[PDB]
Design a protein around this ligand. Structure first.
Ligand SMILES: CCCCC[C@@H](C(=O)NCNC(=O)c1ccc(-c2ccc(C(=O)N[C@@H](CC(=O)O)C(=O)O)c(OCC)c2)o1)[C@@H](CC)N(O)C=O
Ligand SMILES: [Zn+2]
Ligand SMILES: [Zn+2]
Length: 201
């Protein structure tokens, strides 16, 4: 679910950052490592902000709303981290928003790849499962990525942990594809980010 908006792509892949107060040394290091993980596999670079007008701010607040998708422009933008969402893989996911990715399951073509089980969604959280409108996403010829760091788990926003809200529609390597990994960027995330940022081959 890569943004279609050219203005949201950070110029030259350069993303200035500020780490806010109220984070421990340990948390600050994880933010650095998550950024480095993005840097190792793509042409995106994260720089300590000096006088840039547009930059990200690691903002201490409860997990949830919101981390801005792509470059906002004309000022700072939040990447929001709290006590229950400060681990490496979660920060890598939220940095996925920063670089310009929406959630994978919101791709305009997602109904070919996953079923949404509406009856299992927590009432009031259904809006999180709406597709992006087709003018808002350009997938750059890349296949729907079940292994994406941007993909929801099977029971995200579910009424109960044993109730699925998202079910892949078909098998990959003779098994239903696992979804919701928060370990590392997938092959697909890297390939798609490289296309989005026009990285040298
Ligand atoms: C109502 C939508 C809820 C989305 C929550 C979601 C999320 O952040 N998803 C991705 N983002 C969005 O969908 C989305 C929509 C609008 C915005 C957004 C984000 C940040 C700002 C911002 O930087 N605000 C400033 C204050 C300000 O300048 O007004 C701040 O927080 O300091 C934003 O500002 C309005 C444009 C919008 O994000 C989060 C869940 C854990 N998640 O998945 C994280 O990985
Ligand atoms: Zn997210
Ligand atoms: Zn993708």
């Amino acid at each position: 679910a890569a943004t279609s908006r050219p203005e949201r792509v950070w110029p030259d892949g350069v993303i200035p950052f500020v780490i806010g107060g109220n984070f421990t040394g340990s948390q600050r290091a994880v933010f650095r490592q998550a950024m480095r993980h993005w840097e190792k596999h793509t042409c995106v670079t994260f720089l300590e902000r000096t006088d840039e007008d547009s930059y990200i701010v690691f903002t201490y607040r409860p997990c949830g709303c919101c981390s801005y998708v792509g470059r906002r422009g004309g000022g700072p933008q939040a990447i929001s981290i709290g006590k229950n969402c400060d681990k490496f893989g979660i920060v890598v996911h939220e940095l996925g928003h920063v670089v310009g990715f929406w959630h994978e399951h919101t791709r305009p073509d997602r109904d070919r790849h996953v079923s949404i089980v509406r009856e299992n969604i927590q009432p009031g959280q259904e809006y999180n499962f709406l597709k992006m409108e087709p003018q808002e996403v350009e997938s750059l010829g890349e296949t729907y990525d079940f292994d994406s760091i941007m993909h929801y788990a099977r029971n995200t926003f579910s009424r109960g942990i044993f109730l699925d809200t998202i079910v892949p529609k078909y098998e990959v390597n003779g098994v239903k594809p696992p979804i919701g990994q928060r370990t590392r960027l997938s092959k697909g995330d890297i390939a798609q980010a490289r296309k989005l940022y026009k990285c040298p081959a």
